[PDB]
Nucleic acid binder design. Structure first.
Ligand SMILES: [Cl-]
Ligand SMILES: [Cl-]
Ligand SMILES: [Cl-]
Ligand SMILES: [Mg+2]
Ligand SMILES: [Mg+2]
Ligand SMILES: [Mg+2]
Ligand SMILES: [Mg+2]
Ligand SMILES: [Mg+2]
Ligand SMILES: [Mg+2]
Ligand SMILES: [Mg+2]
Ligand SMILES: [Mg+2]
Ligand SMILES: [Mg+2]
Ligand SMILES: [Mg+2]
Ligand SMILES: [Mg+2]
Ligand SMILES: [Mg+2]
Ligand SMILES: [Mg+2]
Ligand code: NA
Ligand code: NA
Ligand code: NA
Ligand code: NA
Ligand code: NA
Ligand code: NA
Ligand code: NA
Ligand code: NA
Ligand code: NA
Ligand code: NA
Ligand code: NA
Ligand code: NA
Ligand code: NA
Ligand code: NA
Ligand code: NA
Ligand code: NA
Ligand code: NA
Ligand code: NA
Ligand code: NA
Ligand code: NA
Ligand code: NA
Ligand SMILES: [Sr+2]
Ligand SMILES: [Sr+2]
Ligand SMILES: [Sr+2]
Ligand SMILES: [Sr+2]
Ligand SMILES: [Sr+2]
Ligand SMILES: [Sr+2]
Ligand SMILES: [Sr+2]
Ligand SMILES: [Sr+2]
Ligand SMILES: [Sr+2]
Ligand SMILES: [Sr+2]
Ligand SMILES: [Sr+2]
Ligand SMILES: [Sr+2]
Ligand SMILES: [Sr+2]
Ligand SMILES: [Sr+2]
Ligand SMILES: [Sr+2]
Lengths: 119, 246, 145, 115
RNA sequence: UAUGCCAGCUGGUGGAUUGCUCGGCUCAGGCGCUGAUGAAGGACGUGCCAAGCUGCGAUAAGCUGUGGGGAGCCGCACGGAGGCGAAGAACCACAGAUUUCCGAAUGAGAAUCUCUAACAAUUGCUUCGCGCAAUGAGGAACCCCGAGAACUGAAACAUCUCAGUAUCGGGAGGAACAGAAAACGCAACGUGAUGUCGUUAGUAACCGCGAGUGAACGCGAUACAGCCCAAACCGAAGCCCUCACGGGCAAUGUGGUGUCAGGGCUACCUCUCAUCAGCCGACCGUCUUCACGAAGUCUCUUGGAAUAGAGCGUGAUACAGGGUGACAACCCCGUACUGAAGACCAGUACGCUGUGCGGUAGUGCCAGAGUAGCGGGGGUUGGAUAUCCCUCGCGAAUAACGCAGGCAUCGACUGCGAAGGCUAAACACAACCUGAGACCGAUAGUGAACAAGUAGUGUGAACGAACGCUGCAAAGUACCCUCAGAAGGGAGGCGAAAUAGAGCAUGAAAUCAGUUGGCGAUCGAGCGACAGGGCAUACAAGGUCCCUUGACGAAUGA
RNA sequence: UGUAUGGCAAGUCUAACCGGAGUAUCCGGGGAGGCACAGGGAAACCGACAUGGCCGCAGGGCUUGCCCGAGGGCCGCCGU
């Protein structure tokens, strides 16, 4: 709807299968041309480059993708705890760009390559 | 008077008689009244729950306990308008008629007057529209209705030295107040009105501040948004002719 | 600014003493209370008067004055122009939902008119004939006897 | 206060004429037009035919209506005429706006107020 | 200078204010029954850890299939441990399995348990056996049939009013009810089932003729649709159960004919496309869900962060809305366009099968009784003599008759066939789905943005609150000192900010601690207004002021 | 029932509702019906000054007191 309350509500209360679209990131120029898509559902295998936070400019492998909080963990994009331990600093996929893909899955690869359905 | 017709390239292509209605004396008061009505007539009825604050058997103790005769329940004041959690004394009411009537003749007169304000370049500029042109309204060939791409209309507007207005409307304002919480965060300047004859221009509609309309049903609000006369308009040769007998 | 808008701060909002605006006592009873007692003034006096005949036995005539007919002679060019001949039945509005058409004699007749209607007033005949005109009673008009 | 922009101009023009030219009627008509609408003149042709005379402009500080018959060849000037009034008047004479009258006769001579 | 007064400053307390919205409120569109095949509701269980909510049912936050979906997952819920998923999990749609006890609650009984085969109870059919079936109870309101106040108004009050309202009993449905004239009575050479909407109209009518109450015909619309018995004349030519055999029903009449364009019968003309029964069975449209889906994440500056400013550039049948570390068409979801599915329209329209319309002549063969109608007594209604109904009593005709047309009787005229029955559509409501908003914005708006009908109150019926906000990211404070100490304190670390460190954005007033200025232990009380002195004063946002003299010089005036 | 403003004017307004569309807005249509255009009378029933006289404000005219004088005022007269 056009109402802000319903818009935010449908986004926060979206079922698991609908949360995949909340972890989508734009593709690099090459990848866009190769698959005929502007963006993709970030996977825990893809390589990504940070374009917005304090980590803008850094690249790394996506180590985790949490659908519940619709956020991602990327290698070396971390914060140092008080005890010295190093923990990940979650990222919103919209502040990120996919530079390499993990196509170990036949289904994902087939999904990306087809013209009718995106991925 | 005579209006100059323009082709899809922006070059002069003959001219036609500007219909008599455009000579109708500009009447901002009548136009404003007509707009006030259209705006009111779309407002939805509202009102608080008729039983709000009344769902309590609260009673007053009366005299004897050194307290005000205010209805209480479980030691809490209830129901009365001065009591927190009590009823609303004179709240909005659903039964209220929020519509405004307007005589057909009086409204039609305003439509004609708004049409005429469109023919005065000084007025159109006074309203706020940005454009480098002497003639107004802008008249174009019926082939305009065949355009498909928004950008092909941009080319035409630039060629007609009327695109400056779209730049003016290409600035959204984030309103002050709680309208934001109800879906009314943005607002923007009103730009060009495109009046065609068969179907509203799909190609011109997404233009910043643009409004599309058809000659048989274009209204006072199309011609004078917010009640302000003199909107920068662009008719279609056929539209310009049909708008004559309104 | 309106009167209402100026009331905040007045306490009484123009009611005088704050003891005034209470219940129906301030009105002398609800509605038409006291119409024969404390508030009898300017009130139609009590009582019955006359009678009414049944609505389906009542006749409703459609009337028109010679003045209206005469002032629009040239305009009524869609009606016969003899040595003007006019059937009033085609002139009067509401003639459909009326039992008959009657021509009354208010005003002047500055032309020679040949009027056809279901009835005419004495003055209507005097005036029409007086300006060299004639009055023609319809078949339905053939009741007076 | 008046709401019609054109009525306001008319009154301002009537005043300007009365002050600048030798007019007194225009200023008279202006004061009356400044009064509430219900007091404004609503005159039918019958009254014009009865009190008007040729070569003396009829001035109506209001609006002229179509009831009655006008035979005299008179120039009638008013704030507004009904569609029928203007038609009947133009047949035997001439209907003119109070604005034209101020232009042709700013001195306001040989004219009769009718209401 | 103590006790202390006034104002302020630093820190509290408090939670106003401003900003924010997971909730409300209201409108609109769609849709609409459930239950003995045991519903709705409740109880008690059910998780590795499990109190609450949500889910589920001993197969217990779940099992199976199909399609979708996808590299993650294990609800709200951001822990730990462990586990599941490419044998395609999660999640979603559709379908199915499981589904304790109480509950209409139905074997008997019982405060959710117990006792010894159960449709308890009332009915229909009946193989007379619970063998086959029905009922019961629920549902936001709407709807239909019954029972039916008072406060109040009349400035008292009784008729009247509030009002057939509140409330009670019974009952159906997705809508109900009504409905094919013993009509209307713009009286007509006229209308033509019924609702409903607009109007007729506050009109006619009622009424301590007071206060008040209050239609209809018609008209303009919406939607439109007309039929079935009883009887005549036929007389078993019939119906129900069963696969069949067979059984049951039915001469107290199954079945044919027939139903006011009356019918039947006898004698004819002609024709059917009416009707009724049944088969087939949508388009379009509407509501919803879903697929697809354009174009920048470029430079510089500032910043913790660029969606900012400046510069350059792009799409647009897409410049609705939302999200993203600040104002985003072009970063993400979406949005336009096009397409797909389900639901409703509707088992309707159309088409089809069977049936057969209709007209003449004759025939007093048939056509609904405690009725029509009248009287007594009530109620009700605008119904007045002329509303509708109840009750007591009386009581007809037979179409060659009868009823109606707003008093009665008789005649005339016009209309119409009661005392049998069915009937789609157009209209009410809002539970449920979706959408919308010049509505409210946490003492508001729901009682409820939170544990909400929660906590809590009452024997019970019933009553009933309050509680929103760390941060960009938990980076949710390591190590050390102190201490009885996982307390607290100190130091320290993180962050733009801890005066963001847990009811953790902002942080008013009342008010409290400390402190600054002024006053203060010989002096008097609406706390001040206006004049004038003391003391006090960082900047900014005000820059004037004092004295000599001179010029001007009103009233007044030496 | 007043009042101010605005449209139209011997008329004026549409109601329900219908079509369109940019789909609660809006454009077109819809005059059923209401009020106004005649009154008086319980009713039956009958049915009026588009001006006949005199004052005279505003305004106009003139040769500057004298004319024409809407509205207004006092009468006639007309309908019942
Ligand atoms: Cl009568
Ligand atoms: Cl007049
Ligand atoms: Cl009729
Ligand atoms: Mg692809
Ligand atoms: Mg409240
Ligand atoms: Mg504000
Ligand atoms: Mg039992
Ligand atoms: Mg009383
Ligand atoms: Mg009564
Ligand atoms: Mg009903
Ligand atoms: Mg009394
Ligand atoms: Mg009543
Ligand atoms: Mg009737
Ligand atoms: Mg039969
Ligand atoms: Mg609250
Ligand atoms: Mg705080
Ligand atoms: Na309550
Ligand atoms: Na007190
Ligand atoms: Na309303
Ligand atoms: Na008072
Ligand atoms: Na003390
Ligand atoms: Na539904
Ligand atoms: Na739990
Ligand atoms: Na189940
Ligand atoms: Na049973
Ligand atoms: Na049995
Ligand atoms: Na009283
Ligand atoms: Na009393
Ligand atoms: Na009474
Ligand atoms: Na009629
Ligand atoms: Na982003
Ligand atoms: Na009744
Ligand atoms: Na009786
Ligand atoms: Na009748
Ligand atoms: Na609160
Ligand atoms: Na001082
Ligand atoms: Na009419
Ligand atoms: Sr979750
Ligand atoms: Sr969660
Ligand atoms: Sr006492
Ligand atoms: Sr007063
Ligand atoms: Sr009271
Ligand atoms: Sr008296
Ligand atoms: Sr009519
Ligand atoms: Sr019909
Ligand atoms: Sr019968
Ligand atoms: Sr009679
Ligand atoms: Sr509070
Ligand atoms: Sr510290
Ligand atoms: Sr002096
Ligand atoms: Sr109209
Ligand atoms: Sr007079």
């Amino acid at each position: 709807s056009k109402q802000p309350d319903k818009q935010r509500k449908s986004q926060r209360r979206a079922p698991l299968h609908e949360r995949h679209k909340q972890v989508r990131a734009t593709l690099s120029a090459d990848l866009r041309e190769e698959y005929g898509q502007r963006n993709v559902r970030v996977n825990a295998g893809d390589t990504v480059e940070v374009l917005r936070g304090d980590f803008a400019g850094e690249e790394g492998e996506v180590i985790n993708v949490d659908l519940d909080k619709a956020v991602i963990h990327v290698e070396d994009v971390t914060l140092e705890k008080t005890d010295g331990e190093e923990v990940p600093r979650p990222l919103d996929t919209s502040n990120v760009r996919v530079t390499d893909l993990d196509l170990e899955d036949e289904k994902r690869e087939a999904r990306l390559e087809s013209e009718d359905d995106s991925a | 008077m005579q209006a100059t017709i323009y082709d899809l390239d922006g070059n002069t292509d003959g001219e036609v008689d500007l219909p008599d209605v455009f000579e109708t004396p500009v009447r901002s008061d009548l136009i404003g009244k007509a707009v006030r009505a259209a705006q009111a007539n779309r407002k939805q009825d509202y009102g608080s729950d008729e039983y709000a604050g009344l769902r309590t058997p609260a009673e007053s103790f009366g005299s004897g306990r050194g307290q005000a005769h205010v209805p209480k329940q479980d030691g809490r004041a209830r129901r009365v308008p001065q009591a927190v959690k009590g009823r609303s004394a004179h709240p909005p009411k659903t039964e209220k008629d929020r519509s405004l009537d307007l005589n057909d003749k009086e409204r039609q007169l305003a439509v004609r007057s708004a049409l005429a304000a469109t023919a005065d370049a000084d007025l159109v500029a006074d309203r706020g529209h940005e454009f480098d042109r002497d003639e107004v309204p802008v008249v174009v060939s019926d082939d305009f209705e065949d355009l498909v791409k928004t950008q092909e209309v941009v080319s035409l507007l630039e060629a007609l030295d009327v695109h400056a207005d779209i730049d003016r409307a290409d600035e959204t304002k984030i309103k002050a107040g709680q309208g934001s919480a109800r879906g009314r965060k943005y607002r923007r300047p009103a730009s060009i009105l495109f009046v065609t004859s068969d179907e509203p221009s799909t190609a011109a509609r997404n233009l910043a501040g643009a409004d599309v309309a058809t000659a048989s049903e274009v209204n006072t609000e199309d011609l004078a948004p917010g009640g302000a006369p003199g909107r920068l308009t662009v008719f279609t040769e056929s539209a310009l002719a049909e708008v004559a007998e309104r | 600014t309106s009167k209402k808008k100026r009331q905040r701060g007045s306490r009484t909002h123009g009611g005088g003493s704050h003891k005034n605006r209470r219940g129906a006592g301030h009105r002398g009873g609800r509605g038409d209370a006291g119409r024969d007692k404390h508030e009898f003034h300017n009130h139609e006096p009590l009582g019955k008067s006359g009678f009414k005949r049944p609505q389906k036995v009542q006749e409703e005539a459609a009337t028109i004055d010679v003045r209206e007919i005469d002032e629009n002679v040239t305009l009524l060019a869609a009606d016969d122009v003899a040595e003007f001949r006019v059937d009033v039945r085609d002139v009067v509005e509401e003639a459909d939902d009326a039992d008959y058409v009657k021509v009354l004699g208010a005003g002047q007749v500055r032309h020679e008119l040949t009027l056809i209607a279901d009835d005419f007033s004495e003055g209507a005949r005097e005036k029409v004939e007086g300006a060299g005109g004639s009055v023609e009673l319809t078949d339905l008009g053939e009741e007076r006897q | 206060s008046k709401t019609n922009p054109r009525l306001s101009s008319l009154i301002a023009d009537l005043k300007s004429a009365a002050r600048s030219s030798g007019g007194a009627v225009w200023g008279d008509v202006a004061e009356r037009l400044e009064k509430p609408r219900r007091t404004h003149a609503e005159v039918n042709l019958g009254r014009i035919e009865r009190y008007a005379q040729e070569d003396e402009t009829v001035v109506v500080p209001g609006k002229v209506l179509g009831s009655g018959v006008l035979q005299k060849d008179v120039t009638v000037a008013a704030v507004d005429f009904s569609g029928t009034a203007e038609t009947k008047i133009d047949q035997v004479g001439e209907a003119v706006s109070l604005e034209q009258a101020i232009e042709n006769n700013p001195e306001g001579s040989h004219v009769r107020v009718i209401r």
